[model samples]
Target: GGTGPIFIKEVSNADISMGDVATLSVTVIGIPKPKIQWFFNGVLLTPSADYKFVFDGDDHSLIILFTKLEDEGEYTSMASNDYGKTICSAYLKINSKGEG
Candidate 1:
């Protein structure tokens, strides 16, 4: 345990298809409340028509709706505290439902 930044971890199912909703759970442990942020394909993910960020008291998670091919990539979850910051990413893959 180092006093610098928060330690964050991501757990999610990568194998998903289009028009499907996936839930990515993130766990953050650190001094002081850590802020949660998300990214998709190296770009800052913002609230969009088909995307959103959610934090559950039981377990922080990001619920994605209407998943598409572009959504397939590194799903990064970041947690920062007064000590330091830590992040983790999951290899997300989205494929066409009709495409076998």
Candidate 2:
């Protein structure tokens, strides 16, 4: 349709306790199928098998068995094309409450 980089939906801020499962996601569209990069704490991310990243709306998931306090950070999403680009950021807090 439109050769554009548009975020149909952006990731929302969220939090979870240590040892609890968590998830994060967003929606976006780019006519050229823009390359989307995921990041956390402003750092490049490549997740583990447990913390799978499934891209739908450029969506992603984290926390399979356990999430650590170190996992807490501001998640940033980048969707881009040669013509345009956009970004989405979200906060994920790892609570000290141990459910284990």
Candidate 3:
């Protein structure tokens, strides 16, 4: 079989309320262990007060704290290795209907 990064699991869309926390996670497996990078709305994401990136071996996760309407957007996870690269994306929706 060919050798390359395989997406064992992909990130899924999330709906969360304002002031809550949201998490987007994905799992990947590769021969040489893939590197991970995350993006938000086509912009590269980095560790900050609003966003936290975590990698535990195969599982990669992005944590959003104190979610707000502005936080709602497209999120992408990219995995790459010497062999190849793969990407997956998901959306986050903030339900702001009856908030003061």
Candidate 4:
């Protein structure tokens, strides 16, 4: 048997203030290096002024610059390779100062 895509590092739950930058990162391993994608609240995410996607070898990352209240939601990392596909999820809980 060969190594299937597996998450070596998973994104962590984040609690950040609005206007701050939020970063989500993950790492995966397999026989064939996996490709990574990020999703927000079950929706496919794209890199924009609000979101930045970075990839370095097996490492992948999503950065949200200038966090917003709407940014508080579940984030998922999907990794896929010829071997198989795997996913990991985490939440971004934004706490706008002075507001719950």
Give the better candidate number (1 or 2) by TM-score.
Answer: 1
Clash pairs detected, candidate 1: 4-83, 4-84, 5-83, 5-84, 5-85, 6-84
RMSD of each: 3.0, 3.2, 2.2, 2.1
Query: lDDT by residue for model 1 over 8-75, one digit each (tens)?
Result: 45666578877799778877666566777788767777777776677765247777888877678887
lDDT of 2 by residue, 1-100 (tens): 5565677778888878888887877777777887776788888677666576666545444433578888788988788887787888989888885455
Worst 10 residues of 4 by lDDT: 91-100
- Score each candidate by Cα lDDT: 0.72, 0.74, 0.89, 0.88
Badly placed stretches (over 4 Å) of model 4 are: 97-100
lDDT for predicted candidate 2 compared with the true structure: 0.74
TM-score of model 4 vs. true structure: 0.88
- lDDT per residue as tens, model 4, 14-91: 899999999999988887777788889999897688888998887888999899888999999998888788989999
- Would you estimate the TM-scores of all the predictions? 0.79, 0.78, 0.89, 0.88
The list of candidate 1 runs beyond 4 A from truth reads: 1-9, 97-100
Which residue pairs in candidate 2 collide?
Answer: none
Residue 20, candidate 1: alpha-carbon lDDT: 94
The parts of candidate 3 lying over 4 Å away from their true place are 97-100
| Minimal lDDT window, size 10, model 2 | 56-65
